[PDB]
Amino acid sequence: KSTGGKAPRK
Amino acid sequence: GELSKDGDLIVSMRILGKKRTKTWHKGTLIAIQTVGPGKKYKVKFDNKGKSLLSGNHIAYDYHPPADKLYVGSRVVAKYKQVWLYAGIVAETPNVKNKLRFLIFFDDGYASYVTQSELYPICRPLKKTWEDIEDISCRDFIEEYVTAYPNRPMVLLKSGQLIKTEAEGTWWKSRVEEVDGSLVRILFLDDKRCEWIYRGSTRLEPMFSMK
């Protein structure tokens, strides 16, 4: 899996 | 162009190999061959299958001596369901993190792991982020590694309310827990938690600081 990563999408 | 050895990579050694799933599995190095511009490493997995892999897609089946790894080290680590997954060392053991390694995984996930939960990749690229498939991840790591040790972060406290980005939307959220350079964020509309780096611009105060 549910990760949103390190930076905003985009 | 067949080899029995390549420095400390010796045919017959225990090894971890990356499968097409992106997860890493135990096996044996059964051959080394020079194909075109470099070496390929043939791995026979303990459970199922064989693969011919580049040297950045195999890892040693031992844990590093702590001071071998540094910020930017390419590693496989326990991703805690539980898998072995590739990442980058973002922070080495210190008092503030209770002697753990911060790992930024290839898919964007972050977690702290112990020394017995990571494995050094055998032949990483000189610029270690250049084999990260996901371009937003790849770019983030390049920037992060290159800027190290300059790490702007926000100070957040348990119970503090902030907006946190996910999937293009800025969501009402709450800080549940602080752990070194990570903050556990509760998304208030759907009630899921995520551990996020306190220097990530997905945190409103950090976004707004730049």
Numbering used by the authors:
A (entry chain B): 9 to 18
B (entry chain A): 190 to 269, 273 to 402
Reproduce text from the manuscript describing this model.
SETDB1 contains three Tudor domains (3TD) and a methyl-CpG binding domain (MBD) in its N-terminal part, followed by a split SET domain, which harbors the catalytic center for H3K9 methylation. We show here that SETDB1 3TD binds to histone H3 tails containing K14 acetylation combined with K9 methylation. Crystal structures revealed that K14ac recognition occurs at the interface between Tudor domain 2 (TD2) and Tudor domain 3 (TD3).
We further solved the structures of the W358A mutant in complex with H3K9me3/K14ac or H3K9me2/K14ac peptides. In the W358A–H3K9me2/K14ac structure, electron density for the K9me2 residue did not permit confident placement of the dimethylated lysine, suggesting that it is partially disordered. In contrast, the mutation of W358 in TD3 (W358A), an aromatic cage residue of TD3, led to a loss of H3K9me1/K14ac binding and a strong reduction in binding of H3K9me2/K14ac, while binding of H3K9me3/K14ac was only moderately reduced in the peptide array binding. In the ITC peptide-binding experiments, similar results were obtained; the affinity to H3K9me2/K14ac was reduced 18-fold and binding to H3K9me1/K14ac was completely lost, but H3K9me3/K14ac binding was reduced only mildly (2-fold). The weaker binding of H3K9me1/2/K14ac to W358A could be explained by the loss of the H-bond between the W358 side chain and the carbonyl-oxygen of S10, leading to a general reduction in peptide binding.
